[PDB]
Design a protein around this ligand. Structure first.
Ligand SMILES: COc1ccc2c(c[n+](C)c3c4cc5c(cc4ccc23)OCO5)c1OC
Ligand SMILES: COc1ccc2c(c[n+](C)c3c4cc5c(cc4ccc23)OCO5)c1OC
Length: 570
């Protein structure tokens, strides 16, 4: 016979509670901003404004008692803990010696990072992406980048997820030496320094917490009280839509690889492996780990780093130790966790690692079969070709010849097939190898007719510098252009060339280009024809599948060709 409680929804954080506590209104150290609790802290205010309040309250979720306490006046705060994420029908009852009176039920939310409190995500995918019936055993991967939500305006709901088996989320940095990040200019180093305040060196952190979990996305129904927002809440709602889709954080990349060179000290691996375990127990929508160390032995962004004697053994030991750790997680959760890595495939990268040994611990190797040539110098070539191009010299394909100095080639040329053949020869199984497709071009200025040695092949010319362009044409940095920008502004609808560009295809390499004879602008990229050739190649050798870099740069054509290529090769 007390008065039945009324729940104070606004005084109770809108009944939005969470196993994870995330700073929403600051940018600080990662340990300061993110705290994951095994039990969510629940605090519910209720009122009994008239009649008697009684002496004790009970709280029910879906009819089960989860808390009790004292009522002492006309307003009570019920504080307790609860361990399971989800949406529940909550009732609060007030009691005295004569009996009990229950509130009407109200939905309470307990967020967890597997997205168990969320509806399936609503998609907004460009309809140029077609539907396919591709064998689900074939890998079809892509990278989604954390910063694609800014100028590129490409959000998680834009991904053609029914055409994907694996989303690699780029990139998770590691605290410690990161001079290469500084060299990129902008805010990227400063953001990292902030995220690492109060964090041990060699531990992982989130680079941009605004993009990852603070930014409110209207399309995902985020409201002020939503306890998890950003890309990560959207990936959580994506897992409810597509439970078999693997979503994997990619650690490192070209500019964030500096700390890996200290992994020759096992204490630094232990610190890192432990922080990755904690990271996956914190963000449960993730299904494994991808290690993008560019590169064991060196030759990447860090000019003064690289140890060709010890980096390969360190990489293999790292893979062994991550697999141990992931097996602990599989035991704790009942889930499968995957271990993968994206790797350089020039012969001088491959020779520094015994991949046949490393790969026994791994599910997949994503072969970076792109960036073979690029704006960093003035030598044109196909950046993502399957085979050796018409432009190459005698003995250059297999490395048995001499260059224009008369200098012996130090190894076989940079092509996808040479890279893949070198891995198979070390004894990596074909069915663990994933072949990469570029969703972007690299290019140059100043490759005019007078520089060519063969007048029908601009890959025989010489450049004056990197391609220049605006973000409106998909050029986010010098010498790189989105495939969707190439299609809009250089190929046009009929794929024959606009705005002074012509299209060419090197049938021996399996590689397209567009060339503007007057500016000497030349761009090397993947198109519908080269991507069908890559799918036939992957089929012929019994590779795991295909992957691409990066998804925001496609308009549908590249991913469609990946699926069409894997249906039809032979
Ligand atoms: C011939 O010696 C050199 C000298 C400098 C570099 C290099 C290789 N890479 C990948 C980079 C590099 C790679 C980057 C970058 C910046 C970079 C800046 C310099 C080099 O930002 C993203 O990726 C190299 O190859 C062994
Ligand atoms: C010593 O001369 C240099 C100077 C700069 C570079 C370089 C070689 N590579 C491969 C790169 C490079 C490679 C990249 C990249 C960015 C890059 C940026 C600079 C260089 O993005 C991913 O691939 C080099 O050796 C030819």
């Amino acid at each position: 016979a007390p008065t039945a409680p009324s729940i104070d929804m606004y005084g109770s954080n809108n009944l939005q509670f969470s196993k994870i506590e995330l700073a929403m209104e600051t940018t600080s150290g990662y340990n300061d901003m993110v705290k994951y609790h095994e039990l969510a802290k629940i605090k519910v205010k209720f009122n009994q404004w008239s009649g008697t309040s009684g002496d004790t309250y009970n709280v029910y979720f879906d009819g089960v008692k989860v808390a009790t306490g004292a009522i002492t006046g006309s307003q009570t705060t019920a504080s307790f803990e609860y361990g399971q994420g989800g949406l529940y029908q909550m009732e609060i009852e007030a009691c005295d010696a004569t009996g009990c009176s229950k509130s009407a039920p109200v939905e309470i939310t307990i967020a967890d990072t597997d997205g168990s409190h969320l509806k399936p995500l609503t998609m907004n995918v460009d309809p140029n992406n077609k539907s396919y019936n591709t064998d689900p055993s074939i890998v079809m991967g892509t990278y989604f980048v954390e910063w694609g939500i800014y100028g590129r305006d490409y959000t998680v709901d834009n991904m053609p997820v029914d055409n994907l088996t694996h989303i690699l989320y780029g990139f998770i940095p590691i605290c410690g030496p990161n001079e290469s990040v500084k060299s990129v200019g902008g805010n990227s180093f400063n953001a990292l320094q902030t995220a690492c305040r109060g964090v041990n060196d060699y531990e992982v952190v989130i680079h941009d917490p605004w993009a990852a979990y603070q930014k409110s996305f209207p399309q995902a129904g985020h409201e002020y009280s939503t306890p998890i927002k950003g890309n990560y809440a959207m990936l959580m709602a994506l897992k409810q839509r597509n439970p078999d889709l693997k979503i994997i954080p990619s650690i490192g990349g070209g500019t964030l690889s500096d700390p890996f060179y200290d992994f020759v000290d096992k204490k630094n691996r232990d610190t890192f492996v432990a922080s990755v375990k904690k990271f996956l127990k914190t963000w449960k929508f993730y299904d494994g780990v991808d290690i993008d160390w560019e590169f064991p032995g060196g030759g990447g962004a860090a000019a003064d780093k690289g140890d060709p004697v010890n980096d390969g053994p360190a990489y293999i030991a790292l893979m062994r130790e991550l697999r141990v750790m992931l097996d602990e997680l599989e035991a704790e959760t009942g889930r499968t966790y995957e271990l993968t890595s994206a790797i350089g495939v020039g012969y001088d990268k491959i020779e520094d690692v015994d991949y046949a040994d490393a790969v026994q611990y791994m599910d997949y190797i994503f072969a970076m079969t792109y960036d073979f040539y690029g704006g960093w110098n003035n030598v044109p070539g196909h950046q993502t070709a399957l085979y050796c191009g018409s432009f190459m010299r005698p003995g250059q394909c297999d490395g048995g010849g001499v260059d224009e100095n008369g200098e012996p080639y130090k190894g076989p040329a940079y092509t996808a097939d040479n890279g893949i053949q070198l891995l198979l020869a070390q004894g990596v199984p074909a069915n663990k190898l994933v072949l990469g497709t570029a969703m972007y071009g690299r290019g140059w200025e100043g490759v005019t007719p007078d520089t060519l040695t063969d007048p029908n092949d601009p890959m025989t010319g010489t450049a004056t510098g990197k391609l220049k362009g605006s973000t409106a044409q998909g050029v986010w940095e010098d010498g790189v252009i989105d495939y969707k920008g190439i299609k809009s502004f250089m190929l046009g609808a009929n794929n024959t060339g606009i705005n002074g560009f012509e299209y060419g295809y090197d049938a021996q390499a399996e590689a397209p280009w567009v060339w503007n004879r007057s500016t000497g602008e030349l761009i090397t990229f993947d198109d519908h024809r080269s991507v069908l050739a890559k799918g036939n190649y992957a089929k012929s050798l019994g590779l795991a599948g295909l992957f691409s870099w990066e998804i925001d740069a496609d308009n549908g054509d590249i991913l469609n060709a990946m699926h069409e290529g894997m249906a039809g090769g032979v």
